[PDB]
């Protein structure tokens, strides 16, 4: 089966 | 199923509580909502059981149930309260305590005592804050052994002594009707808000569930059926980090109806914290406004059928629940492409007995356990 | 195979 | 193994 | 290594710092790409072919003025041909060194062995009065050199009656522990908070020699390469911001406190997939750091290259065609996020010898708006 999701990404500029 | 009283204070219950979690949600001090309607409705049951006046009036007020007799509401609450707790144990962990602590000087009386435990199952114990932090360890003990350490403390202080508190300790583990492989298992963040991030484990595991994303109102909402299907926890949650009050907004008995008509199984990876979240409510303060005013009072409060005399009154209504979120489930048995539920955010959740339709918790996961 | 892509990060801040 | 990270998020307010 | 080559491999890596200064000042300039050892090699050539202050000035922009002319390319010619063959069972390494001169012009037999013995350097000879034919002969051969990997040195010629010193490179680091070749995707990649261009990122998640300066709000990685003979250090900002604050702090003893302050820890490193071409004249930046007469028509002494003064050194021209790739080696708490979809600064340093492989910043990657 396939892997887990990967992690959030990073925030957004200010 | 359940008898006529039981059906329709199950559904008053669940309207209490959606009810009760919409007053704490807009309590800025309130963090983790974690509502039993079934227990938050008996504490009622027991003041009306145990108050004269308007003190058993309003404990019939917030319950919706006036035009009711006193014998049909013990009789129907302890009933649904009976079936709801054993209906739910055959599949998910579930343990559940009620404890009333009064002051020394306080004698319980007879009819009260048989009464209260037969309906609610309500044990009766003295307590003295002479010792105050003896006192505690004495809840603290009584909760860890009902739940078998899962929670292993109610509060850490209690502010109103020379009162009666009532204290329910719960423990509920959900089992999956198809579990997470216990190697699908890391740690991450939970963004707690988009600011302050707490390091959690995390379960991870992708299936079919019934599913709905509304673009309109940028939420997702999934059904996890627990095991063998009796009930079901449900899960409400913004697409992105942002706090649940505009969420909370939508949520109403009859918007639910409409997620739920609108589901479809679909394909979702499913990411949810792994632990214990621990919860303790004093609901005193949110069920005083909702009309539970004088059985709280110092002054007015007349609970005389408890104790023979108008020496007491409702200090505290100790709400405490461990709630797990773990991996363990029924086993279960394939190129679809899963739909994101990412729960490393605030979320509402519900569990719901899927025979009776009765609300079983309502709460909400804002901050769980993790040293960020 | 590996899992899918994690969701977007949070917005920047203000 | 873990699928890649999500995208960046979208600019503050 | 020799004595004379470790000593030549630690100025050439601060050659390095002070060659990338200046072009990070240039406004012209935006990716950069120089491998110090073959800046050096170049600084060797016009030791090798110069006399009086065209030959002391190229020690002196190589900061070797305690060793001799004799163990300066007897040290660079075993350093170039150290990392030449200690990285040639590692990563994908292809180099080349050709020294045009004009037809009229005779290449001395010694200067042609000295210079093939030591820096392997090849000598051509052109005419730029058909323009186009002699800038093929140029791209050809850096074509040969680096399998078409780098088809292109220069587009034009600007100066014609002197020598050119033309460098080829292909360079493809080959990861320690590899990506997974389906660990990738298509990103944005922010030049600026207002531009953004659509590039191919590789994703991987694992343990790195990692740091974070809050105050600074930059962070730091090291990537071991192939079999640990030499690493891949990345400079990035938290957030996208032009790199002139953080080439500000880029000195060789910063790095040094930098590195001294990494612990491994879990990365979830995010990098652009694919060829950057960089193309380098170093004439001009050269001249700022010392090299001011070999580049002057008027006073060049390079009269051991070829028997007579008419002979200047015209362009230097420095081409790399740098591969980022999920290819390497096959092979736990909450990785830290190395995003790299803003600009960074780069560098590849051989772990043994202390000699700085590579040093950059990737600024615009291939693509559209």
Chains 1, 3 share one sequence.
């Not at chain 2, 009306?48 to 006193?70: H, I, N, Y």
């Not at chain 2, 939508?250 to 979702?268: H, N, P």
């Not at chain 2, 079983?360 to 769980?368: E, N």
Request: aromatic share 8%; hydrophobic share 40%; net charge positive.
């Amino acid at each position: 089966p396939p892997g887990p999701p990967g992690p959030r990404g990073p925030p957004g500029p200010p | 199923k359940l008898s006529p009283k039981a059906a329709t204070l199950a559904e008053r219950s669940a309207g209490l509580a959606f009810s009760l979690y919409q007053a704490m949600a807009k309590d800025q001090a309130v963090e983790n909502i974690l509502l039993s309607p079934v227990v938050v409705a008996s504490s009622l049951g027991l003041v009306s059981l145990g108050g004269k006046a308007t003190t058993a009036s309003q404990a019939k007020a917030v319950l919706s149930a006036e035009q009711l007799r006193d014998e049909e509401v013990h009789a129907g609450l302890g009933e649904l309260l009976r079936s709801l707790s054993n209906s739910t144990a055959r599949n998910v962990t579930w343990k559940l305590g009620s404890r009333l602590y009064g002051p020394s000087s306080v004698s319980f009386a007879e009819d009260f005592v048989r009464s209260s435990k037969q309906h609610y199952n309500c044990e009766h114990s003295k307590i003295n804050f002479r010792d105050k932090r003896s006192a505690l360890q004495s809840i603290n003990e009584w909760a860890a052994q009902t739940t078998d350490g899962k929670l292993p403390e109610v509060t850490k202080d209690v502010e109103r002594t020379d009162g009666a508190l009532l204290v329910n300790a719960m423990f509920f583990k959900p089992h999956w009707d198809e579990k997470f492989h216990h190697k699908m298992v890391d740690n991450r963040g939970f963004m707690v808000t988009r600011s302050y991030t707490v390091g959690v484990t995390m379960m991870h595991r992708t299936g079919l569930y019934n599913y709905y994303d509304d673009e309109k109102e940028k939420l997702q909402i999934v059904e996890m059926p627990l095991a063998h299907k009796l009930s079901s926890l449900i899960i409400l949650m913004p697409n992105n980090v942002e706090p649940l009050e505009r969420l909370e907004k939508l949520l109403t008995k009859e918007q639910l109806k409409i997620w739920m008509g609108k589901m479809q199984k679909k394909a979702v990876a499913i990411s949810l914290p792994k632990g214990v979240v621990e919860v303790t409510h004093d609901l005193q303060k949110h069920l005083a406004g909702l009309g539970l005013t004088e059985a709280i009072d110092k002054n007015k409060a007349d609970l005389s059928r408890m104790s023979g005399k108008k020496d007491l009154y409702l200090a505290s209504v100790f709400h405490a629940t461990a709630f797990e979120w773990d991996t363990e489930g029924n086993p279960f048995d394939e190129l679809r492409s899963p739909k994101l539920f990412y729960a490393d955010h605030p979320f509402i959740f519900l569990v719901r007995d899927t025979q009776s339709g009765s609300l079983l918790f309502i709460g909400r996961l804002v901050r769980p356990k993790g040293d960020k």
